[model samples]
Structures are given as structure tokens and as C-alpha cells.
Target: LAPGSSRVELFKRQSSKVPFEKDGKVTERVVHSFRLPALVNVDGVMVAIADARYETSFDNSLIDTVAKYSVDDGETWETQIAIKNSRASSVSRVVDPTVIVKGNKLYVLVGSYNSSRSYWTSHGDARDWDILLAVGEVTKSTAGGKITASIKWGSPVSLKEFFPAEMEGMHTNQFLGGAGVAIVASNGNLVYPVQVTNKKKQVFSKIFYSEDEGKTWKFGKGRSAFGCSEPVALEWEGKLIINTRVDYRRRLVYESSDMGNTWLEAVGTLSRVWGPSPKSNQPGSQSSFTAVTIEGMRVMLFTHPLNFKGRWLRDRLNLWLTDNQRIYNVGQVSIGDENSAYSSVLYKDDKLYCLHEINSNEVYSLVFARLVGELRIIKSVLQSWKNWDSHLSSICTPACGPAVTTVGLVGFLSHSATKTEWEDAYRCVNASTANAERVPNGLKFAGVGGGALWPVSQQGQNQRYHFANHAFTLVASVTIHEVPKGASPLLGASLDSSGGKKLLGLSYDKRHQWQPIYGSTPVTPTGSWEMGKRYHVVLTMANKIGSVYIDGEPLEGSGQTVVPDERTPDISHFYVGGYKRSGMPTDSRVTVNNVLLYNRQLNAEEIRTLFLSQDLIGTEAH
Candidate 1:
């Protein structure tokens, strides 16, 4: 706002047709989930670019996209132009728009999902879309240093870029974030962030970089692993550090030390802005991650509803500040607690400008709030002990925080087993049918009446990528306190000679031909569990085959394979303790820890990396 002035309308959406406006309804359009705000100077005047959706909804309507200019340092904005384009059939609805300035011209890159599918079904094959780049020649008359302007946008051009044709679809620069800030590398290459799909039909945060200044763009050779999306890239320490809104209920960190050359996962490495958890069933829209240098200390702000409860309820728009790593709070005004959806942030000459939304009339027109959504989202993670109704734990903590499903891990049974009151991580550690207990011998023994520790997902929906027929992996560390001469269960339902689904915890039946893959080779242990395991185990199911590895060595040929039964249950709910078919306890006691489950096979390297991360083999060699 030019000096003292504050209130000003940068842009707003006007509806075209009502439900039946004299049948030709010039629908009244309110900014439905206005998002992805980008501010850039075009030929001296400040320009604000945003997608003002037609209604307070997403995807399906005419999004009155616009470009508003202000000559008086953002004081008043009367001059505006409707930014729009049409597809071959109908008007292409544009959403997240990213604007950048380079060599006197302003380049605007915005995403549009094809009419074939909406963003709703975008998680799978429905994700088919492309980015549109609008190049505008700046025609302005400056009175002093900065004056008035209107962009002479060129013809709309489609950025016809694609990875593999079979990737279902691509929404790289769609939704919440526009493209990242355009960067000119040391060697003069232009770079920006773009979500790309991989061989696994999975989305990877990557870059659409070009050494030829927007002429030809190449994809990043590598992709960050473990489920991440909606990346916000910032240039830091001469390297590019990316902040991603991960499905794991937190922001993930990835850095390209060589300017978007390649990528990898960095855990316990850096934790930054966790947008919001969405209060109700409505879930949160994309939060903005904008960077600025405050007093020589790198400062960044993330603003979104502090929705910690329901998935959709939106409230408490906050301005969270971070000196590059951890987030702190700042500013007063925020968006809302209800239909207040997406937002955008910008900092110029010390003042922060956040452009967001709010619902005037919702269910009783609500804007309520709970606690901890943005900065407060950083509470605590899983520990060693499970908090439950059991006895008091050696360590004391108030309660196990809300259940947050981390990316890749939909369920984790035990992280902090240090709580005083025993809370079931999921279901019960010890069922009435099976009495499991934990003995603190230091050497290890899974006490019956409640000591079999393996993470569990209560909701059948939260099952970690477990599709009965899909590829899956289960890993656990246990000291075989005792393996009855007969068979004992570790996970999945009870196994019969006929074979079954989700059944992995193998046993050494000693019987020559106890059970075969198809009644062929008796499922005896080609490799032994040995007397003392302080050892680990890996069970992999892929290509319809089940493989097992123990102590970094594949049992039954370790790195080897065996065919499994064809029968598969619709869902595979995991369990611990013994017999354990929904808690029909058999006689089995073993010390378990680091029990992990992966929806996909733990590739050889991954399996090896985890094996060494913990001290296995109980001996000093570990």
C-alpha cells in the first residue's frame, strides 16, 4: 500500500451464470479458493497474478484468472486484465499461476488439468494435465523510476512436456503451488520446480530446467523417494533447497547441491513448515512458502489453517516464520477457520502481503479453531514405548499425540514406548484371548499378556499400502526367546498347508515336508533362526513370490525366493504376539523391536541400509 493506504482489491472473480439467471445468467462469481499468488514487476509496475476461482469450489468452473497492476507501489489497483485461454473444445480452466521476470519481459507459467479429469481423481490415472506459459511484452510509461503498465500477453502456448506415456497423468505444477522461482544458474541455465512421475506411477518433486533460457527444458534425472508433493523451492547457501508438503503430515526437505541435477531423501536432516492437517473432512488447500532476507537472517513464512483435527475444517490462518530451518510466528491477520482455503504470500521492502480466502456462509457460517496446525504441527514423533491402558511405563509423558500417518508409513506401532499410561498404539498389545507381557531383562523377552510390539493401523483404510495382491514388505527384529517345535505366528492370519494371503512370519517346522509352496518343497528353514538372534528379518512379496531374509542374510536362501499360495484376502490386517488371527493367542514369546512394514519391496539396497541402521545380531559385533 503506497505508504499509508491499506485497503485495496487486487483482484476478484465475477460469476458468469447463476443456476438459472433468466436462463442466460451472468453467473455471479466469488473467489472460490483463490490461490497461488505470484507478484512480479513487469516493465516498472507491480503486477499481481492469481487464480480467482468462479465459485468457492475447485476445478469444475470458469476460474476468472486475472492480472492486476499498481503504479503507486501497490497503493490502488484499478487497472486489471482478465487472463484466460481456451482449449480446442471449451475454455481451459487455469488454476495455479506462477509469474517470473527475466530480460525485460514477464513469463507466466500456470497449470491446467485437461477436461478429461478433475484434480479430484488426480492421485491415480486421472492426473492428466499440462502447463501453459503466457509471455507478455511490457508496454509502460514511467513518470519517474516506476509508473503505469499493462502486459501485452502473447498467444497462449502449451508446454508440451511429458515423461513416460504410461504414467496415468501429470499435475506437476497444478494445485496449490505454481512453478518455483525461475533461477539463472552459475553457468547461465534457467531452472524451476515441476512435479514429475516415475516408473512406479508415483509423483516425484523435480525440475524443468533449461540451459537455453526457456527454449528447451529437460527433466531432473533423479527423483526424491518416499512420497512427496507440492514442492516450494528456494535458493539457499548457493544450493537449491526444496520444501515439500508431504502426505506424511509434515513438510519434507530435499536439496539439489548441484542445481536440480539429482535428488535423494534427507531425514532427521531438516524439518520445516508443515502446512496444516485440515480440521474437518474438507482437508487443507496448499500453503505458501515464501522466502526473504530479514536483517541478514534468512526468513521464510508459511501460512495456512492450524487445522489439527478434522481433515477439511479450515480455520486460524497464521503467519509462521522460520530463519530457514525451524518456524516461528509473526503477523496478526490471517485467512479463516472455515471455507478459507488456499493462500499466497509475498514480501516487499519489509511488509508481508498474504492473499487468501474465507467463507461467509457455511454450516451455521463457522470459523472455529482447535490447536496446532501450522507451527504448532511440530509436536513430537513416535517413540520406543506404546502409551496404553496397561501399567505405568518407566518413562512419563502426557499422552500419545494425534495419529498422523507419515508418507510411506500409514501405520507405525511403536515409537515412544515411554508413556506412563498404556495406550494401545492400535487395537491391543495384549488381547484377552492372548495374554502378552514385556520383561525388561535388558537381554529381551516379549512378555505375554502384552509385550508383542509391532505398529498397527486401526483404520482398515490406513493400512500401509496393503493390497492383498500388490507388492509388500515386512521387516522386524526379534530375539527368538523360544520357537515352539511346532509353528507360531508373527504377523498376518494363521497359515495352513494350503498357503494364504498376508502371511509372512515363517517358522522352522523341522517336519521334512510341513508345508510347501504348492505342496512341493516342505517349507523348512534352509537357513536357521540360530540360537541367539539379536537378529533382524525381511519378508518381501513381489511378482507373486515371497522371499525372506534374516540377519542381513536371506533365510531359506536369504536373497532367494519361493512361490506363495494364490488365495489372497481382500485386505491384510497385520498383527503381533502369537497365533494372532485377530488375537486368538497361541503359545509363542519373542522379543520384538524395529518392526516395520513397507507397501513395496524393500529393494536390496534399502533392505541393507536399514539392517545396519540398527544393532542386530545381539552380539557386540552389532
Candidate 2:
């Protein structure tokens, strides 16, 4: 097992040099803003980067690149040092640093832009956008059983001569390295992710590569065009995969087998780790991903704000693990307060570390913390993923089993017509109902207060859903017998956790739209509920987020916050159609069938299959 806990230390304070115009003259002052974090490990030495914005947090301002070092793998750190600084002028500013290591040398890429001109609106002038590269050498020494690392940075240089001629005619012409990790590919070539903007201000994510270590850089693009920016790259299974942040919607992913010449889409493979879908009502933020081999298995670790606590793009920083095949939410790394964002990750020696921008009372600071606790959980969850995949491939004929049969399944209730007491296929629980009758189509409930309830776990049952604390999925096939005269709940649960006062439910309100109930509050989502129509509803709680899906599609404006509390007890009952005073409407009749509960969140593909396949859940055995 990996180490369970590691100390979280404040790596540096917020103090950046900013230039401003006072009385028509440029002047410099210190500011308390920091942004854009980048982390890398060069031969056992940890390098962390953050942009210090002197005036404000925006990009079009006076900013300088700074770094801090850790020799004993984050156990101790050195003081902050300036790697790239700009002259005190309106047109001289260096910002956005990303670093890569080759041998003992460190290469830092930054975007130098006119402090008065924003990249979103700048055009033509070479001064408006300049690509700069800073080179440095790392040295390590040992004395009296104590080791330390030091860096010597050389002069920064402009890559204007290597830029394409077409950039001279564009708006944001230069390749600005955002808060992403540059990689030294398995083939020994140096590749860095950067974003370039065209005349229309449309941003595209491309790579600049150097086959000769860091000598000559050449820009590489996809065979086709797409709109995206802020790219993070990694080599997976002999192919290069890049995840890009998009302005219009969810993050886009493309793969290049031949070093980024012709890119193809790897859509839906990474899912939430890349970014939530547009229906999730989220905007993309700068995220970092790195690969590490643990116990002879190669896996990728991605860090980004989970957007759970609030709608802010920079919310809870969560870590996700993927085998480059299936992704799992490891856990939260920061206490989410809508303040953490723009993080970079690197894993070393059984420990995971992140450098991120986290603000307190609106005062921004850079932090470095070890996610070794999350690393333990990641290893366990990853093994389950491996075991499930191996089982599916070894015995199942063409993956013949229904998704409910997968690992982490708690129960599957078919609500058989033969009995009023619905039988749980997994035998995890026995469901009981009030004023409900068994029907051929499943169970029927009428009048003002009728629904089903199941004791998923006793108070001290020690079951997976004992406290309803971990990730879980609730899915059911619901059909309304008639239009409701008032607001009615479809399913809900009251957890002994959360002070025994919090309630999570899905309801069809009087307005005929789907609404999600979070404790004492209810949120309206843009969708309608009709009579005699069957809807496949999926409600999931994972990574401190509650989400609803209709017809296997995420509902817009339906991502609810699941407050993270320390003491999680047990859930007395899992209710269907209602709980206590909140069941189906008296005048509105309804029937629920094919109800399933899992101890883990189901992926998008699994949910889609459950929604689209007609005979997939035809029998109780499935």
C-alpha cells in the first residue's frame, strides 16, 4: 500500500512585479496575485512554476515567471527565484511558463506579450505576441548525508526566427505555452503543448517539437482544423494524446500515432477527466496530466477543478486516474471553496504532488501538497478496474452481461409482477412498499403518498452504502401514469450522515420539469415530464458532486453540490417514488421498474447502453 498521508505546505507567497502607466510614464509595483502553476521532476529535483501578476489576475497585465525548488521530493524547499522577468515597461511582459527536462537541462517556455494589449484582441504586431524560451541547468550536491539541488538560469531568447510566416498575419500569432506539462516523449523528442490564435481570434492547440533536444523548434498541426486551446499532452500506448481546453464546449481530445502529423479523435474515452460535457454547465479550465508507472503498470494522473462546490471553473481540485482506457475519480486534493485552479501534477516515488493556485479571502497564493493519501485509494480502485476488465475479456462472450453485473453493484430490483415485495437480484436488500401493487410492467403506485423503500444497509451493517459517503449511482426506469396535479418526487434518500437532515432526490415539479433536491434546496433543470412516457433516469454522486441524467444524457444545470463533511454515518433507507411526506402525487399515478443501485458511478458509455438497448433489462436476471 502507498503512504496514507503527507504534509501540505504553502510553497510561496503572492508577490509579483507589475508595470503600470502613471502620469503617462510606466512604473513598476508589487502585487498580490499569482496564477498558472506548472510542476516537473528533473532527475529527483522538483521544479514548481507560477506566474506572478503584479496588477491583477488577468492575462493582459505585467507578469513574471518564478520558480521554487524541492530536493527531498517536497520534504524541503528552497526560496522563490525569478526565472524570467520583463523590463518595467508597458510592452515588455513575460507570462505563462511551462517546463520540460532533457538530461540535466531545464527548458522553460513563456509567452511575452505587450502588457497593454490583450491576446484576445491583439493583431499583427510582433511585439504583441512573442515566444520566449529560457534555458537553465540543474546541479545536485551532497554533504554530510544532506543533499541539495540548485539551478543556474541562462539568458532567455526569442523564437521569432523559427515562427511560421503565416503568423505575421494573424491576431494571436505566437505559440503561448499555458499551464501544461511539457513532455520528453518515449522516443527521446521534446514536445510542448501551446495554443495559437488565428485572425478571427479562434484558438487552436498545437505542439512545437525539437528532435535535437532544444535546438530547433518546429510547429506541428493536425491534418484538419478545430477550435480549442490550452493543451496537455502525454504518450499513451505508443501514441501521442492531447487534451485541449475549449471555449465553446467540453474539452476535445486528439491522438497522433506519427508524432502529431495527422490527428484523430479519441472522443468519450477520457470523459470527465478531459472535461464535463456541455450539458454539465461547466467551462473548461487549465488542467495538467502526467504518466507514471506503478507496480509495473502504466497509468495517467490528471488534476483539475471538479466544479462541485460552485459553478466557478476553478472549484475543487480533484485527481483522476486512468489506464489510458478507463478513468476513475480518485478523490479531492484541496478543500474546495471555488478558489483552487490552474494546477500541474507530477508523481514520484509512490507519492503524488500538485502545484496549484489557491486563493484565500481573494488573496492568491501558490501551494504544493502531496496527494499520497489519494494515491493509496487510486491504487485500490485501479486494481478493481483491471480485474473487471480482465474478467469481462476472459469469460464473458462478447461482453454478454448487463452493466449492472459489473463490479461495485449493490443491488438490481426488477419489481417483479409476481410479488408486491420487490426482490433484489443481488440479494443485497429486500424492498418494501406502501399502497403499491405489483403489475406486469413492474410496480404501480397511485394516490397522494405511495412509494417503495429499501434498507440498503443497517446503521452498523458495514456495507458499502452504509453511510452513503462513497461514490454511488442510482438508476431507474420511470413511467408516469398520469400528469401530476402538484410537485412529486420520483426517488430520494435521507442519510444519517449530514446531521441526518440532508435529503437528495429527483422530482417532477408542478411545472412539469425535472428538479434536483439538495437538502433544503431544490434546483430546476430545463426538461419536461409527460404522462405515459417512460424515462430512464440516472442520479449519481461522485467526487462531491451530484448529477442527473435523462435518457443517458446529462441534464443541463443539474449538477448539484454534495457538501463534503467529515462524519458520514449510514442511510436508513433508499426511497423510490418518494420518502416520508414526499411520494408521488395523489392524483398522479406512476410505476417504476428496472431500478438499479451501484456502489460506483457508471461511465457515460455504460449509461448510454442502459438507455438505448430495449431488451438489455428485459428480465430480472439481467
Candidate 3:
């Protein structure tokens, strides 16, 4: 959301600046919330456009592609550009506008369709649509010193006029929305990515070009992967990189070393794994791809609605930073976080601006704003809950979880195994004789005494995972069904007496009588062993001091300066439930579930998040 030559900013362009009430009801200013944002930089000036219905009703059947110009970096809004009564015939609605700048001229392309038999919204209705073009130039305002796009006019033309009849077979629909800025190819042709659905009803992205500025246009050869509906494009090193929407729920990149002529697939192992996770009612979300230079490193930006839990809901807007080589990040800007839909971003003068649609109570509002970084849009997700106190509660007698959980720690131990956890995080190592039975939350072991699960083990050539370093946190949910006669262990590592110094279990009192082990963090609060009840014990270790906590509150004075073994092989051998020094069970008998582990020491808030399951999911912005 930058600016135009001369006009009110978008925030001021609407009928009213804020939502108003007409008849005891606040009217939704945006009407049927607009979507598919398209933005371009006219010099440092910003031009924004989107597709939306005219009123408070949610209907796309008769929508208009509207444009608002801003000169003061989207602070105000005026000078709306909507195709009112075009001379073009057989047009019922105009939508999905693709706007770009070429030198001093601004060009717009939109799909003009009549959904009649007339509405022939069909597979073979290729020739039933028209592509409308608009052109304008920025100039100084006569009445003021601000810049402006004085005027423009043009007759609509058929899309068939731009493509050859040879193939005579390509089901084309609306132009891609908010994909990326249009590119003026190295050959001096304006190139655009358009959505073309093949006969199979799958998305086949096709590229089109214009050689005569915004005048005559023609088709380009390369099409995107099937199923990738909306695609964004970026120009780096004079080459175009196209990042498209989800293909079976994943993001992939198409690169063309030769302008927009040929796009070759460019997804690597990591790209398929951590690529844009767009969400829809099903899969794939609308995304924007922009290019930038961060500290002299080439970085590509992605803006889309990515909510992990929602199938295709846009409760969040995420910006991913990547170099096509694995370095990536997620941004969290809250203004458009709730019910956010399609979006577009503007990066100018080292700052980031966004134009998006936020739907609240079924009413949509178009919002414009800046983010956290000095000028760069910081990519971070916000927590839905107000703060720690909002979710904080004393340990209950029944001691249920905090409802929200933030389990981004290294090697999380829980009854629930996410798809990502199964692939990236480790699993329970099978050894000894412990029976697995399904519990309410997850599997719990019926260990005769020292039934344990290994988080860091020496199994494969690439070892399970080792954390024999300095810091780590151990978390567990257990029921004190039985009290141990000797000191019982909940979490610790195995020692071959070969990695470093000989080790021992770190759990309940190293030497105590009739003390409970489930949820016991080496902290004696003078309370009798509470049986038939559950507890969440969290133990954190750092170079400074080793700490312990139950539920969210930490023990008063149970801090020790115990330095752990630093050698590799010895540290890698670790376990949960009850620790065993030499593959043997002790008198430890605890029914533990929701086991979690962290290689880094947990702070007070961090430990609190363990019990707060909902907070865990929301705080994970990326």
C-alpha cells in the first residue's frame, strides 16, 4: 500500500472511513469483503486494486474489479477506478484485475465474463470471455502539488485476439489475483501470469505477453503445474521465478531462465517440505511473490493466509522469507490476522506495506497497514491470547492441561504426534518390556518399574538425536497411582560409562522414602504424596542453574548449579518415564503421558506454554 500520483488513500476511498450503522445495525463498509489484491509500484507511488461485490451481500456472481490510488503511501484514499459502463458487450461482471507499471504508464487487465448460456461458464467457454485493458499516465495535479494519474480510456478486446488459433484448446478463466507484480520482460514485452483451467478442471497457469506496451498482446509458451490455481511471479537477475498456490497442499516454484518464455520446475527437497502452506476450505491459498535484497542477500517474499488447523480458513496472514536455498522465516502482523483473506504487499524505501481483506461477523473490511520491522516487514505470528496471565491458572486437583500448548521445542514428547513431528521429531524407542495401552490422550506404558521411552537414542547411522550438551528441559504429565519405596526417576539419560563421567538418574529425591515420582521435580513442598491425581512437572537446565517446576509455578528454592556431561555419545543416550543407567528398571512406577522435552532451558513463560496447548498452536506463526 504505497501511493499514486494524486488521490485519496485507500483508507479514505470508501464511502465511509469506518463501519457505520444505518438501522440499529453497523453496516460493513467493505460490503461483501473484497479479495484478490493487486499492487504495483508506480515509481515510489503505490496503486492498489481488488475484486469485490458492490454491497453488503456475499455474491461474486456480479462483482467489479475496483482500483484506488494513493500518493501519500496509502494514508488516504480517493480517485476510484472501476469499470462502470464499458462499451464492450456481452459482459456481465469484471473481476481479477492484474495491474503493473511500465516506465511512466500503468496498465490493467481484467476478465470480462457473462455467466449466461449466454452464462456459459463452461470448460469449452474459452471464447466466451473478453479481456479488458486500461491505460493511464501519472502527472502533476493541477490543483495541488501531489502527483496523479490524470486519465485513461480504452475499448475492451477479445482474449482470442492475443493468442493463436493453432492449439484452439486452452480453457482460460480469470486472471490470477495478487500473484506478483507484472514483469516487463528483457525483450521489452509486458508479461503476465493468467489462470487457465484445463479440460480436467485443474489449474494450468499460462503466461501471456504484450509487445506494444498495453496495446497488442500475445500468448507465451510455458504453463504452470496442474492444480496450482493462483501463482505469483518474481524477477531476479532479469529472470522470472513463479511461485504458485498449493499443489496437493504444498508450494512449488517454477523458474524461467528466459523471461516468461519457459518456466522449469525449481522445487528442491526442502521446498517441498517447508514451502508455502496455503490454506483454503480445502487446500492451496492465494499468494504473492516479490523479490528483495536483504543485507545484500537475494530474498524472495511470499504473502498468503496460512492457518495450520483450518482446512482453508484465513485466520492468519503469513509472510515467508526465503532465498530458494532453505533460509526461511514467518511474519506476524496482527491488524489483518483475524479472518484474513487474499492479500498483496508493497516493499518500498526499505519498508513493507500490505493491503488485505479482513472478515469479521461475516462483514469484510479492506485494511492497510505497516508491520514490525524498521522498514522491513518482520515475519512473526502473534499469540491469540492476551498474555501469560490470561491463560495462567494454578495446578488443579484433577490438574488438567492449560488448554493451549506451544510445542515448538526441540524433540517434543507428547501423546499427540503431528505429521511434522513424525517426520522431523523422533519416536519412542522400543526396548525392555513395557506394554503400550491407549490412554485418554495418548499411549501410556505399563512398565513393571522402569518402563521408559528414549527421546535421544543411538539407533540409526544418522543417530536418533543427541542432546548431551549443556541445556535441556524435561516435561511430563503423570498420575501418581503408586508411591515408590525408593527414589523414583521420571527423566534422565543412559550412560555407557564411555561418553563422559558416569551418570545417575535425576528425578524425585535421589534418596527418599514413600515419595511419588509422577510429576515430582526434585522439589519437596512438604505435601503428602497425592495419589489418584495427575500433575505436570517441568524441569529446566541451563549453564547458570538447574530449575524445576510443577504446572506453571516454579519451586521456591530448588535451584542447583549442576553442570551436565558435555561429551557426544553419552549425551545422546536419553530416556523418559523412568531412567535406567544400565537397561534395568528401578522401583519407579509412574503412569506418565504428554511427555515433552526441550534441548534449551525453558523460561517461566515457556514452561507455562507447555500446559497451554492452544497457546502453543497460535504462537507458532510460521
The Cα error of candidate 1 at residue 495, in Å, is: 35
Best-matching candidate per lDDT: 2
Write candidate 3's Cα lDDT for 1-622 as tens digits.
2122122224322343223223445444543455566776676567776665545324335455555666676775554544532323323466667777787666766766665323222445465466676665655363665565443434444554665543335544434333435667667878787666544455666667777875677656766667666666767666677766664455656777765568776532112322333322335667767777644445676666655446545667765555442223445533434766667777776667777666666565567766436233232211211132132233221235433333324343334433222111222233232444445433444444345545333432112233333456767676655565545565554444221221223444333322322112343433333666666667665553555566666555446544433432334454555543334545555566655555456677656766554223221222
Give the winner by TM-score: 2 or 3: 2
- Give the residue spans of candidate 3 off by over 4 A: 1-31, 56-59, 85-91, 116-124, 142-155, 165-180, 259-261, 269-281, 294-296, 309-311, 335-337, 372-622
Candidate lDDT (C-alpha), each: 0.46, 0.65, 0.51
TM agreement with the true structure for every prediction: 0.50, 0.62, 0.54
Candidate 2, residues 432-494, lDDT tens digits: the string is: 766677764357777655677766333221122432454668888888776666666677665
Best-to-worst order by TM-score is 2, 3, 1
For model 3, the run of ten residues with the poorest summed lDDT: 380-389
Provide C-alpha RMSD values for all models, in order: 12.6, 12.9, 16.9
Q: TM-score winner among the candidates? A: 2
Poorest 10 consecutive residues by lDDT, candidate 2: 458-467
Please estimate how well model 3 matches the true structure, expressed as its whole-model Cα lDDT. Answer: 0.51
